[PDB]
Amino acid sequence: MDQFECINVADAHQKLQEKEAVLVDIRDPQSFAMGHAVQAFHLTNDTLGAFMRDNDFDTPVMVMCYHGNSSKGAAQYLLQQGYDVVYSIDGGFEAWQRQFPAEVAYGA
Ligand code: NA
């Protein structure tokens, strides 16, 4: 569709466990290596090209950032590129680590 939706980390974790959506983390590389959701793909300007060749526009994509704010602009951007199903995770990594502390990974 032509709008994205904001979802909470419990909802995102369920879509992930169900293999219904992919998770992309748009934080800087240092922040990403210091700890990120298991299974998140590090999506930056430099990795965008690859991401799009690898994930069709019909793939639900959930976007995670620092606190749930920048993921909005990034989600809208992905819609503009042709992605139809895009979400922004309210609370960002902070909420994810709080709710699912055992599901954090380190490094790239
Ligand atoms: Na943010």
UniProtKB/Swiss-Prot annotation:
Subcellular location: Cytoplasm
Induction: Expression is positively regulated by cyclic AMP-cAMP receptor protein (cAMP-CRP).
Phenotype of gene-disrupted mutants: The deletion mutant displays no apparent growth phenotypes. The mutant is capable of growth on glucose, glycerol or acetate minimal media without supplementation. Deletion of the gene decreases total rhodanese activity by about 10%.
Chief location bin: cytoplasm
Enzyme Commission (EC) number: 2.8.1.1
Record-level GO BP terms: glycerol metabolic process; sulfur utilization
SMART domains: RHOD
EC category name: transferase
InterPro entries in the record: GlpE_sulfurtransferase, Rhodanese-like_dom, Rhodanese-like_dom_sf, Thiosulf_sulfurTrfase
Its job: Transferase that catalyzes the transfer of sulfur from thiosulfate to thiophilic acceptors such as cyanide or dithiols. May function in a CysM-independent thiosulfate assimilation pathway by catalyzing the conversion of thiosulfate to sulfite, which can then be used for L-cysteine biosynthesis. The relatively low affinity of GlpE for both thiosulfate and cyanide suggests that these compounds may not be physiological substrates. Thioredoxin 1 or related dithiol proteins could be the physiological sulfur acceptor.
PANTHER family: FAD-DEPENDENT OXIDOREDUCTASE, THIOSULFATE SULFURTRANSFERASE GLPE
Self-association state and partner proteins as the record states: Homodimer. Monomeric in the crystal structure.
The protein, known as: Thiosulfate sulfurtransferase GlpE
Species the sequence originates in: Escherichia coli (strain K12)
